[PDB]
Design an enzyme around this catalytic site. Structure first.
Site, PDB file in Angstrom:
ATOM      1  N   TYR A  26       0.814  -1.196   0.000  1.00  0.00           N
ATOM      2  CA  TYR A  26       0.000   0.000   0.000  1.00  0.00           C
ATOM      3  C   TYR A  26       0.859   1.263   0.000  1.00  0.00           C
ATOM      4  CZ  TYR A  26       1.002   0.822   4.952  1.00  0.00           C
ATOM      5  OH  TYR A  26       1.651   0.988   6.162  1.00  0.00           O
ATOM      6  N   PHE A  36       1.964   9.748   3.085  1.00  0.00           N
ATOM      7  CA  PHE A  36       2.309   9.707   4.494  1.00  0.00           C
ATOM      8  C   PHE A  36       2.806   8.331   4.934  1.00  0.00           C
ATOM      9  CE2 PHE A  36      -2.316   9.137   4.265  1.00  0.00           C
ATOM     10  CZ  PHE A  36      -2.471   7.929   4.890  1.00  0.00           C
ATOM     11  N   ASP A  37       2.584   7.293   4.115  1.00  0.00           N
ATOM     12  CA  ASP A  37       3.066   5.972   4.459  1.00  0.00           C
ATOM     13  C   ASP A  37       3.033   5.101   3.225  1.00  0.00           C
ATOM     14  OD1 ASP A  37       4.146   3.984   6.130  1.00  0.00           O
ATOM     15  OD2 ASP A  37       2.193   3.403   6.946  1.00  0.00           O
ATOM     16  N   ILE A  56      -8.082   0.519  10.105  1.00  0.00           N
ATOM     17  CA  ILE A  56      -9.241   1.390  10.064  1.00  0.00           C
ATOM     18  C   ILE A  56     -10.409   0.749   9.303  1.00  0.00           C
ATOM     19  CG2 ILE A  56      -8.013   3.513  10.443  1.00  0.00           C
ATOM     20  CD1 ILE A  56      -8.063   3.957   7.350  1.00  0.00           C
ATOM     21  N   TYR A  82      -9.793   8.257  10.526  1.00  0.00           N
ATOM     22  CA  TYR A  82      -9.371   8.769  11.849  1.00  0.00           C
ATOM     23  C   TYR A  82     -10.283   9.883  12.373  1.00  0.00           C
ATOM     24  CZ  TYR A  82      -5.502   5.643  11.232  1.00  0.00           C
ATOM     25  OH  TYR A  82      -4.764   4.492  11.044  1.00  0.00           O
ATOM     26  N   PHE A  99      -5.819   5.481  -0.683  1.00  0.00           N
ATOM     27  CA  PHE A  99      -4.811   4.455  -0.680  1.00  0.00           C
ATOM     28  C   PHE A  99      -4.762   3.801  -2.053  1.00  0.00           C
ATOM     29  CE2 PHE A  99      -3.705   4.113   3.779  1.00  0.00           C
ATOM     30  CZ  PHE A  99      -4.767   4.730   4.389  1.00  0.00           C
TER      31      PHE A  99
HETATM   32  C1  LIG Z   1       1.108   0.029  10.308  1.00  0.00           C
HETATM   33  C2  LIG Z   1       0.494   1.105   9.621  1.00  0.00           C
HETATM   34  C3  LIG Z   1      -1.063   1.136   9.498  1.00  0.00           C
HETATM   35  C4  LIG Z   1      -1.686   1.998  10.608  1.00  0.00           C
HETATM   36  N1  LIG Z   1      -3.090   1.646  10.835  1.00  0.00           N
HETATM   37  C5  LIG Z   1      -3.372   1.111  12.204  1.00  0.00           C
HETATM   38  C6  LIG Z   1      -2.699  -0.174  12.528  1.00  0.00           C
HETATM   39  C7  LIG Z   1      -3.045   2.201  13.228  1.00  0.00           C
HETATM   40  C8  LIG Z   1      -2.086   2.168  14.209  1.00  0.00           C
HETATM   41  N2  LIG Z   1      -2.229   3.351  14.875  1.00  0.00           N
HETATM   42  C9  LIG Z   1      -1.466   3.818  16.042  1.00  0.00           C
HETATM   43  C10 LIG Z   1      -0.663   5.031  15.699  1.00  0.00           C
HETATM   44  O1  LIG Z   1       0.326   4.692  14.735  1.00  0.00           O
HETATM   45  C11 LIG Z   1       0.774   5.857  14.028  1.00  0.00           C
HETATM   46  C12 LIG Z   1       1.892   5.405  13.116  1.00  0.00           C
HETATM   47  O2  LIG Z   1       1.354   4.468  12.195  1.00  0.00           O
HETATM   48  C13 LIG Z   1       2.343   3.853  11.407  1.00  0.00           C
HETATM   49  C14 LIG Z   1       2.920   2.641  12.098  1.00  0.00           C
HETATM   50  O3  LIG Z   1       3.802   1.993  11.547  1.00  0.00           O
HETATM   51  N3  LIG Z   1       2.334   2.239  13.270  1.00  0.00           N
HETATM   52  C15 LIG Z   1       2.791   1.070  14.004  1.00  0.00           C
HETATM   53  C16 LIG Z   1       1.593   0.057  14.073  1.00  0.00           C
HETATM   54  O4  LIG Z   1       0.465   0.485  14.327  1.00  0.00           O
HETATM   55  N4  LIG Z   1       1.869  -1.217  13.865  1.00  0.00           N
HETATM   56  C17 LIG Z   1       3.157  -1.871  13.453  1.00  0.00           C
HETATM   57  C18 LIG Z   1       2.644  -3.188  12.922  1.00  0.00           C
HETATM   58  O5  LIG Z   1       2.276  -3.058  11.540  1.00  0.00           O
HETATM   59  C19 LIG Z   1       1.409  -3.497  13.815  1.00  0.00           C
HETATM   60  C20 LIG Z   1       0.741  -2.217  14.075  1.00  0.00           C
HETATM   61  C21 LIG Z   1       0.035  -2.088  15.392  1.00  0.00           C
HETATM   62  O6  LIG Z   1       0.647  -1.743  16.432  1.00  0.00           O
HETATM   63  N5  LIG Z   1      -1.344  -2.256  15.403  1.00  0.00           N
HETATM   64  C22 LIG Z   1      -2.276  -2.122  16.603  1.00  0.00           C
HETATM   65  C23 LIG Z   1      -3.305  -1.159  16.364  1.00  0.00           C
HETATM   66  C24 LIG Z   1      -3.250   0.176  16.797  1.00  0.00           C
HETATM   67  C25 LIG Z   1      -4.258   1.123  16.548  1.00  0.00           C
HETATM   68  C26 LIG Z   1      -5.383   0.836  15.814  1.00  0.00           C
HETATM   69  C27 LIG Z   1      -6.318   1.770  15.490  1.00  0.00           C
HETATM   70  S1  LIG Z   1      -6.303   3.316  16.235  1.00  0.00           S
HETATM   71  C28 LIG Z   1      -7.772   3.826  15.275  1.00  0.00           C
HETATM   72  N6  LIG Z   1      -8.165   2.807  14.521  1.00  0.00           N
HETATM   73  C29 LIG Z   1      -7.357   1.733  14.627  1.00  0.00           C
HETATM   74  C30 LIG Z   1      -7.738   0.592  13.764  1.00  0.00           C
HETATM   75  C31 LIG Z   1      -5.432  -0.493  15.365  1.00  0.00           C
HETATM   76  C32 LIG Z   1      -4.465  -1.461  15.661  1.00  0.00           C
HETATM   77  C33 LIG Z   1       3.298   1.478  15.438  1.00  0.00           C
HETATM   78  C34 LIG Z   1       2.221   2.218  16.236  1.00  0.00           C
HETATM   79  C35 LIG Z   1       3.748   0.206  16.167  1.00  0.00           C
HETATM   80  C36 LIG Z   1       4.496   2.468  15.295  1.00  0.00           C
HETATM   81  N7  LIG Z   1      -3.209   4.093  14.355  1.00  0.00           N
HETATM   82  N8  LIG Z   1      -3.689   3.349  13.311  1.00  0.00           N
HETATM   83  C37 LIG Z   1      -4.061   1.634   9.900  1.00  0.00           C
HETATM   84  O7  LIG Z   1      -5.215   1.220  10.193  1.00  0.00           O
HETATM   85  C38 LIG Z   1      -3.874   2.145   8.568  1.00  0.00           C
HETATM   86  C39 LIG Z   1      -4.245   1.090   7.524  1.00  0.00           C
HETATM   87  C40 LIG Z   1      -3.218  -0.016   7.416  1.00  0.00           C
HETATM   88  C41 LIG Z   1      -1.748   0.525   7.122  1.00  0.00           C
HETATM   89  C42 LIG Z   1      -1.414   1.720   8.138  1.00  0.00           C
HETATM   90  N9  LIG Z   1      -2.526   2.647   8.205  1.00  0.00           N
HETATM   91  S2  LIG Z   1      -2.349   4.143   7.554  1.00  0.00           S
HETATM   92  O8  LIG Z   1      -1.514   4.012   6.369  1.00  0.00           O
HETATM   93  O9  LIG Z   1      -3.625   4.776   7.469  1.00  0.00           O
HETATM   94  C43 LIG Z   1      -1.419   5.100   8.729  1.00  0.00           C
HETATM   95  C44 LIG Z   1      -0.060   5.281   8.522  1.00  0.00           C
HETATM   96  C45 LIG Z   1       0.617   6.153   9.402  1.00  0.00           C
HETATM   97 CL1  LIG Z   1       2.243   6.529   9.191  1.00  0.00          CL
HETATM   98  C46 LIG Z   1      -0.037   6.752  10.427  1.00  0.00           C
HETATM   99  C47 LIG Z   1      -1.402   6.506  10.674  1.00  0.00           C
HETATM  100 CL2  LIG Z   1      -2.204   7.242  11.977  1.00  0.00          CL
HETATM  101  C48 LIG Z   1      -2.081   5.745   9.760  1.00  0.00           C
END
Ligand SMILES: C=C[C@H]1CN([C@@H](C)c2cn(CCOCCOCC(=O)N[C@H](C(=O)N3C[C@H](O)C[C@H]3C(=O)NCc3ccc(-c4scnc4C)cc3)C(C)(C)C)nn2)C(=O)[C@@H]2CCC[C@H]1N2S(=O)(=O)c1cc(Cl)cc(Cl)c1
EC number: 5.2.1.8
Length: 107
Positions: A26, A36-37, A56, A82, A99
């Site tokens: 993606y 942004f990613d 999401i 979000y 995306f």
């Molecule tokens: C791993 C990136 C995905 C982020 N998310 C979910 C998992 C997400 C995580 N978060 C917490 C804040 O993270 C901000 C940075 O996100 C990039 C990143 O690499 N995050 C990491 C991350 O979330 N990861 C790393 C692994 O891939 C596993 C995953 C993880 O920890 N997942 C748990 C989780 C955490 C939060 C959520 C949330 S919060 C609101 N809704 C949800 C579903 C759902 C599941 C990190 C927090 C460990 C550093 N908010 N949303 C998406 O739904 C969506 C769709 C799938 C691909 C990414 N996105 S995104 O491209 O829209 C995205 C990218 C970025 Cl740089 C920042 C955001 Cl806020 C969104």
């Protein structure tokens, strides 16, 4: 909601099912057009399990509308991403997200 537009067709028949691991590449872009990613930079696909709500809503619903091998443009409204608050410093308040998603495999 989430709108799904084909960029390259998939097989037309193999759609993600609840509990499968979905394997994608993606790129995510804001409405201003800025990336942004992306998984493509990492040379490692992104995986999530459908039904776990660990991505999401627009992904849970939009990627489920793709068939294996498809590349699609997902346009996701803020309430399917979000929301009012966004994610400070990355996703603006009330942001529509775009995306480019390629559904590689189901595991
Ligand atoms: C791993 C990136 C995905 C982020 N998310 C979910 C998992 C997400 C995580 N978060 C917490 C804040 O993270 C901000 C940075 O996100 C990039 C990143 O690499 N995050 C990491 C991350 O979330 N990861 C790393 C692994 O891939 C596993 C995953 C993880 O920890 N997942 C748990 C989780 C955490 C939060 C959520 C949330 S919060 C609101 N809704 C949800 C579903 C759902 C599941 C990190 C927090 C460990 C550093 N908010 N949303 C998406 O739904 C969506 C769709 C799938 C691909 C990414 N996105 S995104 O491209 O829209 C995205 C990218 C970025 Cl740089 C920042 C955001 Cl806020 C969104």
């Amino acid at each position: 909601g989430v709108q799904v537009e084909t960029i390259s067709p998939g097989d037309g028949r193999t759609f993600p099912k609840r509990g499968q691991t979905v394997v994608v590449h993606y790129t995510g872009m804001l409405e201003d057009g800025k990336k942004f990613d992306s998984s493509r930079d990492r040379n490692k696909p992104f995986k999530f399990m459908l039904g776990k709500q660990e991505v999401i809503r627009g992904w849970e619903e939009g990627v489920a509308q793709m068939s294996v091998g498809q590349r699609a443009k997902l346009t996701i409204s803020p309430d399917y991403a979000y929301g009012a608050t966004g994610h400070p410093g990355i996703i603006p308040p009330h942001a529509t997200l775009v995306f480019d998603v390629e559904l590689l495999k189901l595991e």
